[PDB]
Amino acid sequence: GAPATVTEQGEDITSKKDRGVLKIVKRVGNGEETPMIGDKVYVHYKGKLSNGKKFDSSHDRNEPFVFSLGKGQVIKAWDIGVATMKKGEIAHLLIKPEYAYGSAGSLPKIPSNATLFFEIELLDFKGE
């Protein structure tokens, strides 16, 4: 999968309305509930640099990724994005640097001012 080449496709889900996290639903979820801040969320994901140079997935480990929503345990785009998802939902997120690794980057894995692209499947969640 990859972001569109010419125009940004997704909905802006940021509080600042800065176009920093754009969301496309790739599978509508079956659950009625969205997780709340502090919830323990369980996901699968696939992530890449927008240009494809680096790839990572929970499926590579067959190991769901588990984190506390809103804690800052993950990049800002994930706290924002997963907070909009339903159980069973698959979303694609296009993520601008401010909501990822910024101008500092995280070499060697992530250059400065990299846009990231993720597929996230929300498996389940609970209150802590």
Ligand SMILES: COc1ccc(CC[C@H]2OC(=O)[C@@H]3CCCCN3C(=O)[C@@H](C3CCCCC3)c3cc(OC)c(c(OC)c3)OC[C@H](O)[C@H](O)COc3cccc2c3)cc1OC
């Ligand atoms: C509040 O802001 C931040 C919070 C946390 C972090 C640390 C990085 C954090 O990773 C992430 O947040 C996102 C989303 C959750 C899945 C992993 N992830 C990644 O960016 C991936 C990237 C995705 C693009 C392709 C290269 C690998 C990503 C996957 C990785 O491994 C699976 C990375 C990694 O390091 C930068 C980034 O290795 C880091 C470690 O060696 C180890 O594997 C643990 O990986 C984790 C665990 C928890 C969280 C993360 C990585 C930076 C933040 O801002 C810059």
